[PDB]
């Protein structure tokens, strides 16, 4: 099956979702699609990694992190697109919440 | 003449695209390795025609990764929750220096 984060986003694909980061970034948005991908490295590279990722449509930034160290916020803050890649491989969130506040996924 | 989108050529990278095309060497090696790749309909010419029309016309989610709703079926997505395939109109174009590939994605 899917990893626990991708599984959660698919389970709640019909929900507005709040994603939080340890950095203090908080966004709200909706799942657009899910796709099989990798980290661009050669298949011979010992760091080559395949993973599933979500395309996530950000409808509002609810909290800006006080530092700019995360890849997700560094993409969003340019405003070239409100779609962003979400995965466990690269700059994972710490929590997924429903809009009633219920925590449906938390990082391990 | 190959156009460019954000510095990447709008040209199929054959080996990368073939990982999603049944009966190709690269597809058959993915399946032998225990993967179940989403299926892209047609061949590398189908992929080049879709790239010509849609590359740069979708929404980027990361440098070198663009989601496109193609408005018609382009393949079948492998649903890991069921182990079966679902027809899809959506794809993620993965760009590189040696060309791009269309990865069918979840509808």
Numbering used by the authors:
A (entry chain A): 2 to 109
B (entry chain B): 428 to 534
What does the paper say about this structure?
Here, we structurally and functionally characterized YxiD-YxxD, a predicted member of PTS from Bacillus subtilis 6633. Using growth curve assays, we established that YxiD-YxxD codes for a toxin-immunity protein pair. We further demonstrate that YxiDCTD is a metal ion-dependent tRNase that cleaves several tRNAs.
We have solved the structure of the active site mutant YxiDCTDH528A in complex with the immunity protein, where highly conserved His528 has been substituted with alanine. The H528A substitution was introduced because His528 is highly conserved across multiple sequence alignments and is probably involved in catalytic activity. YxiDCTDH528A structure consists of three α-helices (α1–α3) and three antiparallel β-sheets, consisting of nine β-strands (β1-β2, β3-β6-β7, β4-β5-β8-β9). The crystal structure revealed that YxxD consists of two α-helices (α1 and α2) and one β-sheet, comprising six antiparallel β-strands (β1–β6). The structure revealed that the YxxD binds to the active site of the toxin, consisting of highly positively charged residues and sterically occludes binding of the substrate to neutralize the toxin. Structure reveals that the loop connecting from (Asp33-Asp46) β2 and β3 of YxxD plays a key role in binding to the active site of the toxin. This loop is highly negatively charged, composed predominantly of acidic residues (D/E). While in YxxD, the blocking of the toxin’s active site is mediated by the β2–β3 loop, in NmMafI2, two alpha-helices are involved in the toxin neutralization, highlighting different modes of inhibition in these toxins.
